């Protein structure tokens, strides 16, 4: 599922260890 208010952008580490959810 993909539901986010602020899509991922301008980030260094991808899929880091912070909340399992990567899909706006």
Number of helices: 0
State the shape.
flat
How far the N terminus sits from the C terminus, by CA atoms, comes to 9 Å
Beta content: under 5%
Radius of gyration: 9 Å
Structural class of the helices, strands and pairings?
little secondary structure
Function: Binds to bacterial LPS and may specifically inhibit the LPS-mediated activation of the hemolymph coagulation. It has a strong antibacterial effect especially on the growth of Gram-negative bacteria.
Protein name: Anti-lipopolysaccharide factor
Subcellular location: Secreted
Disulfide bonds: 2-23
Quick rundown:
The chain is mostly loops and 24 residues long.
What do you see in this structure?
- It is classed as antimicrobial protein.
- The entry lists the keywords antimicrobial, antimicrobial protein.
- The assembly is monomeric.
- The entry is titled "Structure and NMR assignments of Scylla Serrata anti lipopolysaccharide Factor-24 (SsALF-24)".
- The protein is 0% helix and 0% strand.
- By secondary structure, it is mostly loops.
- The chain contains no helices and no strands.
Pick out its properties.
little secondary structure; flat; 24 residues; Anti-lipopolysaccharide factor
Write the SSE topology:
Elements: no helix or strand
PDB class: antimicrobial protein
Keywords: antimicrobial, antimicrobial protein
Assembly: monomeric
């Amino acid at each position: 599922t993909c539901h986010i208010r602020r899509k991922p952008k301008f980030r260094k580490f991808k899929l880091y260890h912070e909340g399992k959810f990567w899909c706006p």
